[PDB]
């Protein structure tokens, strides 16, 4: 299997400052059909999960012009520009290029 490492674990973010996280993989995520499968999931407390960024650097449904991601291979980052109060929860990175589907560690974001 392929393991995922998320750095950092707890990221205190001021309400209105830029923030950035990271996720890394032990193997290349490139697939035979020329795609890289990375999913960024927002896990708000007591609410349904949300897909923020799919396919490394492509915006999914919703995501009101705030979240964006970038990365080439085995090193990916997520960027938030104007952090609001609703962006509190856990963030996970999941692969899809090889079974089993392995999630990430986690990154708790709280208002400081």
């Amino acid at each position: 299997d392929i393991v995922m490492t998320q750095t950092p674990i707890s990221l205190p973010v001021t309400p209105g400052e830029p923030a950035s996280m990271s996720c890394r993989s032990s193997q290349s995520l490139l697939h035979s059909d020329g795609r890289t499968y990375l999913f960024w999931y927002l896990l708000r407390p007591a609410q349904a999960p949300q897909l923020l960024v799919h396919d490394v650097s492509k915006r999914a449904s919703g995501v009101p012009e705030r979240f964006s991601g970038s990365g080439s291979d085995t090193d990916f980052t997520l960027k938030i520009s104007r952090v609001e109060a609703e962006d509190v929860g856990s963030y996970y990175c999941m692969q899809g290029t090889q079974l089993p589907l392995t999630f990430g560690g986690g990154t708790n974001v709280e208002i400081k």
Binding site: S32, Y37, D55, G96, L99, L101
Partner: peptide, 11 residues
Amino acid sequence: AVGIGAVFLGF
């Protein structure tokens, strides 16, 4: 609904 490459029986 965006696609996962793990559900793919190869050659």
